[PDB]
Design a binder for this molecule. Structure first.
Ligand SMILES: *[C@@H]1O[C@H](CO)[C@@H](O)[C@H](O)[C@H]1NC(C)=O
Ligand SMILES: *[C@@H]1O[C@H](CO)[C@@H](O)[C@H](O)[C@H]1NC(C)=O
Ligand SMILES: *[C@@H]1O[C@H](CO)[C@@H](O)[C@H](O)[C@H]1NC(C)=O
Lengths: 43, 50
């Protein structure tokens, strides 16, 4: 388990919050993101 | 008129404290759908003070 996403619509009409953990850091950002259809974090 | 400054004129529900909705989706005032374009019951959500 390496991150979380929070929001209303989770698409560009709306703001949403992203948390990603990369083992050097926890990175947190709040944008009018566009999400992928099946989100993933690298091998 | 300065048109760089704006306020939201319409919303579906009131903001909670320190909530900050920047969405520019067209305000549907009634049963008429917007489909991404302005029209009857379908109005741009911001105004500029001018
Ligand atoms: C973790 O995120 C920070 C964000 O500034 C980046 O500098 C760092 O290289 C990242 N670490 C890894 C292992 O990806
Ligand atoms: C929060 O988002 C939902 C999304 O369906 C919306 O119905 C609700 O009115 C919003 N609440 C506020 C206080 O903006
Ligand atoms: C910044 O937010 C406003 C309000 O949602 C929007 O009109 C504008 O297009 C956004 N900026 C970019 C680069 O899209």
């Amino acid at each position: 388990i390496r991150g979380w996403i929070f929001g209303t619509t989770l698409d560009s009409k709306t703001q949403s919050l992203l948390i990603v953990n990369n083992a050097t850091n926890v990175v947190i950002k709040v944008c009018e993101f566009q999400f992928c259809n099946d989100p993933f974090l690298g091998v | 008129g300065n048109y760089n400054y704006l306020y939201r004129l319409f919303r579906k529900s009131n903001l909670k404290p320190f909530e900050r909705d920047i969405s520019t989706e067209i305000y549907q005032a009634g049963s008429t759908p917007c489909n991404g374009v302005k029209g009857f019951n379908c109005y741009f959500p911001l105004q500029s003070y001018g």
